[PDB]
Paper text:
Here we determine the diversity, potency, breadth and structural insights of bNAbs derived from memory B cells of BNT162b2-vaccinee after homogeneous Omicron BA.1 breakthrough infection. The infection activates diverse memory B cell clonotypes for generating potent class I/II and III bNAbs with new epitopes mapped to the receptor-binding domain (RBD). The top eight bNAbs neutralize wildtype and BA.1 potently but display divergent IgH/IgL sequences and neuralization profiles against other variants of concern (VOCs). Structural analysis consistently revealed diverse modes of bNAb action due to their distinct binding footprints on viral RBD or spike proteins.
The structures revealed that both antibodies interacted with RBM residues mostly outside the ACE2-binding site (left). RBD binding of P1D9 involved CDR L1, CDR L3, CDR H2 and CDR H3, with its footprint shifted upward on the RBD backside compared to P2D9, which used CDR L3, CDR H2 and CDR H3 (left). The binding residues of P2D9 included G92, D93, S94 in CDR L3, S52 and N58 in CDR H2, and N99, Y100 and V101 in CDR H3, interacting with RBD residues including G339, N343, T345, R346, N439, N440 and K444. Clearly, the RBD binding epitope of P1D9 overlapped with that of P2D9, but they were not identical (right). In contrast, the potency of P2D9 was not affected by F486V alone, similar to some class III antibodies (e.g. LY-CoV1404 and S309), and therefore could more potently neutralize BA.4/5 compared with P1D9. Aligned structures indicated that viral G339D and N440K mutations could form new hydrogen bonds with V101 in CDR H3 and G92 in CDR L3 of P2D9 (bottom), contributing to its neutralization potency against Omicron variants. The heavy chain of P2D9 might be pushed upward in the context of mutant RBDs, which might explain its relatively reduced neutralization activities against BA.2, BA.2.12.1 and BA.4/5. S371F and T376A mutations in BA.2 and BA.4/5 sub-lineages could shift the position of N343 glycan nearby, and therefore, conferred partial P2D9 resistance.
Residue numbers in the entry:
A (entry chain A): 333 to 469, 491 to 527
B (entry chain L): 1 to 27, 27A, 28 to 210
Amino acid sequence: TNLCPFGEVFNATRFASVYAWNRKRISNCVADYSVLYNSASFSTFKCYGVSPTKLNDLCFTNVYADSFVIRGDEVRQIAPGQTGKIADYNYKLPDDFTGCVIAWNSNNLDSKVGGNYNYLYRLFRKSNLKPFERDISPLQSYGFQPTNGVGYQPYRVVVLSFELLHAPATVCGP
Amino acid sequence: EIVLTQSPGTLSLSPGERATLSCRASQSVGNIYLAWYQQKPGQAPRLLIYGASTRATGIPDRFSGSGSGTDFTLTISRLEPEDFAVYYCQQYGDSLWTFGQGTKVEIKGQPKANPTVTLFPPSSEELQANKATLVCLIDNFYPGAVTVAWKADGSPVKAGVETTKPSKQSNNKYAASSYLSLTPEQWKSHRSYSCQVTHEGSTVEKTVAPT
């Protein structure tokens, strides 16, 4: 088949907010993962369970590219067993996560003069989320100015999840 | 932010020949963060390339864009009569968004052509109206790099001299004309007025006089 529409996800004409993150499914296509891990346009590329170079060998039933937009310093929150506002009340990865987290600076794309507030996050919640949960019921705006420091600038992020079903495999590498 | 500097400024080539334009950036931009444009005289511009290496909807394959980082290229492999225009690179990477200065793809397959030089004194009508303008015409020449000098008697006039820039023709030679605005007093108190031209060597001269 054709290439898996990684392009469409990894770079869409602007992304969605973190609290109401995007849950895009990728199936029935040939997936070259080298196109991704060979690129130096990322300031973050971490993997869990499996090595990203080995994925060209491997087949999966489905592949889910969860994507969102967060602040700066919080990129390390996007991980298993982590703590913080985002890992608690917005987006949480499981302790036994089998996938890869990729992020990059988007100050040029998602900051405005006087601030770009249309990006939000959940501040208050009575308890913490379960792995891969989204609440959509209170909240707080980020407010990205281009004049900010590295830690306070917007970072678009995508997380790949590889599904291991006892069902026909549709997403394989070269 | 970012400053853009194309090169060269002008490119004199023939229908059939190959034409390549570079575009230099002050800061880095990824591959998929650049576009190229064409502008024919007296028209809204036209998109050619986007994402540095993606052709626009229905662009011929003779047009090909490329490059990376801060150095980018646009190649027209088989120039046509329609490929004459000003060509602008334009970066989309960071904010602000910026445009390049613009490079003129000039049509040379023409040899060195000396201009026809003709001269016209003020209309008696204009003189009655208390003003005196002289017109010195230079047309059908190549290339568009030229100079003109005015003479009150045997002495050069300095101010009141405004000239129309290289107005390119359909036969792709050029045309330019100079205006000299004076008073009726000054026009009448000098025995003769001259117009000197130097185009690629030869210094030609023409003359008029109040009879």
